[PDB]
Amino acid sequence: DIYTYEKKLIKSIEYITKNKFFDDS
Amino acid sequence: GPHMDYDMLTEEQKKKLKEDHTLKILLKNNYVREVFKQFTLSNDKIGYLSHYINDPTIVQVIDHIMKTIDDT
What we know:
heterodimer; A: mainly alpha; 68% helix; B: mainly alpha; 5 helices; FMR1-interacting protein 1 conserved domain-containing protein (chain A)
């Protein structure tokens, strides 16, 4: 099901963005 | 009695995301970093994800993230 998969996915987005994985500056 | 609480990203899953460098190659795409940054500022996270399940670039980076946190 999609709704159980999204809860792990969205907490990965919210971690990756907060730590700015793509930004070296 | 006891119940599950596994709808939060763990310290081991955080470590496996930040130390995996193949993930960083996918996030370095300027089209991925803009959609990831707009996602957290949206008021309807589930409605936003439902626009990106249809995108062939965003599906491929999501699939690698979702593998990395399942591979604990």
